[PDB]
C-alpha cells in the first residue's frame, strides 16, 4: 500500500512540479502585463490632462 | 556407516548443483528486484527534490 502510494505521489508531484513551473511564467506575465497597462494608463492620463491645460491656458 | 556416507555423497552433488546453477540465478533476479525498488525510492527522493 505504501509503495504504490509512493510512486503514485511521485508521478503526482512530477505533475505538481511542472504545474508550478508553468505558474511561474503565468503570474510573471500577469504581473508584468499589469505593469505595462499601468505604465501606459499612467503617462496617457498625463498627456490627456496636459491637453486639458493647453486648451484652457 | 554406509547408508549415511552414500546419502550425503548424494547431498554433496545436490548442493554442488545448487551452488553452480540456481542460487547464482536467483541472486541475479533478486538483485534486480532489489535494484528496482532502490531506484524507485531514489526517484521519490529526486521528485521531492524537484
From TrEMBL, chain A:
Name of the protein described by the UniProt record: ATP synthase subunit b
UniProt signal peptide: none
Subunit-level organization: F-type ATPases have 2 components, F(1) - the catalytic core - and F(0) - the membrane proton channel. F(1) has five subunits: alpha(3), beta(3), gamma(1), delta(1), epsilon(1). F(0) has three main subunits: a(1), b(2) and c(10-14). The alpha and beta chains form an alternating ring which encloses part of the gamma chain. F(1) is attached to F(0) by a central stalk formed by the gamma and epsilon chains, while a peripheral stalk is formed by the delta and b chains.
Gene: atpF
Subcellular location: Cell membrane
Function according to Swiss-Prot or TrEMBL: F(1)F(0) ATP synthase produces ATP from ADP in the presence of a proton or sodium gradient. F-type ATPases consist of two structural domains, F(1) containing the extramembraneous catalytic core and F(0) containing the membrane proton channel, linked together by a central stalk and a peripheral stalk. During catalysis, ATP synthesis in the catalytic domain of F(1) is coupled via a rotary mechanism of the central stalk subunits to proton translocation.
Domain of life, per lineage: Bacteria
Organism: Mycobacterium tuberculosis
Family, per entry: Belongs to the ATPase B chain family.
Residues of the full protein shown: 58 to 114 of 171
Automatic annotation (TrEMBL), chain B:
Localization per Swiss-Prot or TrEMBL: Cell membrane
Family in the record: In the N-terminal section; belongs to the ATPase B chain family. In the C-terminal section; belongs to the ATPase delta chain family.
Protein purpose: This protein is part of the stalk that links CF(0) to CF(1). It either transmits conformational changes from CF(0) to CF(1) or is implicated in proton conduction. F(1)F(0) ATP synthase produces ATP from ADP in the presence of a proton or sodium gradient. F-type ATPases consist of two structural domains, F(1) containing the extramembraneous catalytic core and F(0) containing the membrane proton channel, linked together by a central stalk and a peripheral stalk. During catalysis, ATP synthesis in the catalytic domain of F(1) is coupled via a rotary mechanism of the central stalk subunits to proton translocation.
Complex formation: F-type ATPases have 2 components, F(1) - the catalytic core - and F(0) - the membrane proton channel. F(1) has five subunits: alpha(3), beta(3), gamma(1), delta(1), epsilon(1). F(0) has three main subunits: a(1), b(2) and c(10-14). The alpha and beta chains form an alternating ring which encloses part of the gamma chain. F(1) is attached to F(0) by a central stalk formed by the gamma and epsilon chains, while a peripheral stalk is formed by the delta and b chains.
Protein name: Multifunctional fusion protein
Stretch of the intact protein here: 1 to 50 of 446
Amino acid at each position: 500500500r505504501e509503495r504504490d502510494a509512493m510512486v503514485a505521489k511521485t508521478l503526482a508531484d512530477n505533475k505538481k512540479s511542472d504545474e508550478q513551473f508553468a505558474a511561474a511564467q503565468a503570474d510573471y506575465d500577469e504581473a508584468m502585463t499589469e505593469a505595462r497597462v499601468q505604465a501606459s494608463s499612467l503617462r496617457d492620463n498625463a498627456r490627456a490632462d496636459g491637453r486639458k491645460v493647453i486648451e484652457d491656458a | 556407516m554406509s547408508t549415511f556416507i552414500g546419502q550425503l555423497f548424494g547431498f554433496a552433488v545436490i548442493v554442488y548443483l545448487v551452488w553452480r546453477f540456481i542460487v547464482p540465478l536467483v541472486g541475479r533476479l533478486m538483485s534486480a528486484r532489489q535494484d528496482t525498488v532502490r531506484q524507485q525510492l531514489a526517484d521519490a527522493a529526486a521528485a521531492a527534490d524537484r
